[PDB]
Write a protein that binds this ligand. Structure first.
Ligand SMILES: Nc1nc2c(ncn2[C@@H]2O[C@H](COP(=O)(O)OP(=O)(O)O)[C@@H](O)[C@H]2O)c(=O)[nH]1
Ligand SMILES: [Mg+2]
Ligand SMILES: [Mg+2]
Length: 294
């Protein structure tokens, strides 16, 4: 994953391999290349500075200038730096008997596809999901989820035009109660940009529906710019976790590496394809190892 970054990080580190002990000027050259690699991957400035800082300082603390295999030392410290940036320990929502989740984000971020992906994911984990197309102004948006629900074999409750959050709540609670659905996935409305009035409806919907999780869906391809809306959603609504989509089309990885710093929210899942099966729980340690070709 993150082809360009993986290639560059590995190339930079390899310069310290197969040539005996290295000089600090040798180390500095590799450190500068790593820094350039991060900047080119669209990684947050502070994250990049911190990254290289600890790689250097940790390597030096591990007597890298005296090691007979210095590239292995740097690889290890680069792995720890990567792991930190990605989130440390993997995290996933803790499900209970009743689970109502909100999928929020701008249009095109991958909300509808992710809703279905999550339905299919938990469907095979002992859960009975219910998809809810909550756009009370755009019928076309609701239809999109309707078709997807069919493909994944998961029921889709469509809200009616202008339906009040109270009517939506009672209708969802009824369907879920009568059909034994323990995982409700609400696909909320979204525009190409943050809409104040729309954000007001969203907050009101949260108040009435009382979601257990509020997943902010982010298109990794938009770079670190994708994280700009995070603050707005958390203040007005309250984001509990993130979903990074289109990671299969992201060669940089800037959004994934910067999410932690900028948003302070954990990444629960990663979208790795346009297909309903293209969903994977976010694993910081696994991803760090992959990027470094481990
Ligand atoms: N390659 C790839 N495409 C994705 C992924 N998630 C969503 N998409 C595509 O992104 C576009 C927008 O997704 P959609 O669910 O409609 O977003 P919404 O407007 O936020 O509901 C669609 O063409 C999807 O097929 C992903 O993980 N990988
Ligand atoms: Mg460890
Ligand atoms: Mg949608």
């Amino acid at each position: 994953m993150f082809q360009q970054l993986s290639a560059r990080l590995q190339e930079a580190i390899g310069r310290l391999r197969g040539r005996g002990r290295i000089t600090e000027e040798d180390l500095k050259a590799t450190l500068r290349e790593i820094r350039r690699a991060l900047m080119d991957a669209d990684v947050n400035l502070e994250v990049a500075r911190d990254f290289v800082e600890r790689v250097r300082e940790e390597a030096l603390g591990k007597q890298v200038l005296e090691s007979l295999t210095p590239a292995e030392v740097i690889l290890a410290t680069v792995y720890e730096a990567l792991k930190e940036a990605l989130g440390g320990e993997a995290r996933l929502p803790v499900l209970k008997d009743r689970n109502l989740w909100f999928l929020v984000g701008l249009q095109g971020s991958g909300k509808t596809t992710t809703a279905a992906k999550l339905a299919l994911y938990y469907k095979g984990k002992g859960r009975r999901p219910l998809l809810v197309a909550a756009d009370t102004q755009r019928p076309a948006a609701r239809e999109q989820l309707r078709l997807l629900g069919e493909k994944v074999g998961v029921p889709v409750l469509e809200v009616m035009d202008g339906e009040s959050p109270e009517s939506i709540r009672r209708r969802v609670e009824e369907k879920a109660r009568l059909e034994a659905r323990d995982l409700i996935l609400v696909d909320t409305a979204g525009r190409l940009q943050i809409d104040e009035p729309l954000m007001g409806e969203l907050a009101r919907l949260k108040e009435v529906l009382g979601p257990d999780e509020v997943l902010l869906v982010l298109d990794a391809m938009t770079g670190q710019e994708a994280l700009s809306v995070a603050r707005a959603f958390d203040e007005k609504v309250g984001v509990t976790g993130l979903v990074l989509t289109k990671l299969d089309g992201d060669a940089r990885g800037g959004a994934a590496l910067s999410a932690r710093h900028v948003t302070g929210k954990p990444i629960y899942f990663a979208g790795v394809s346009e297909k309903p099966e293209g969903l994977e729980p976010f694993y910081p340690e696994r991803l760090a190892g992959r990027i470094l070709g481990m």
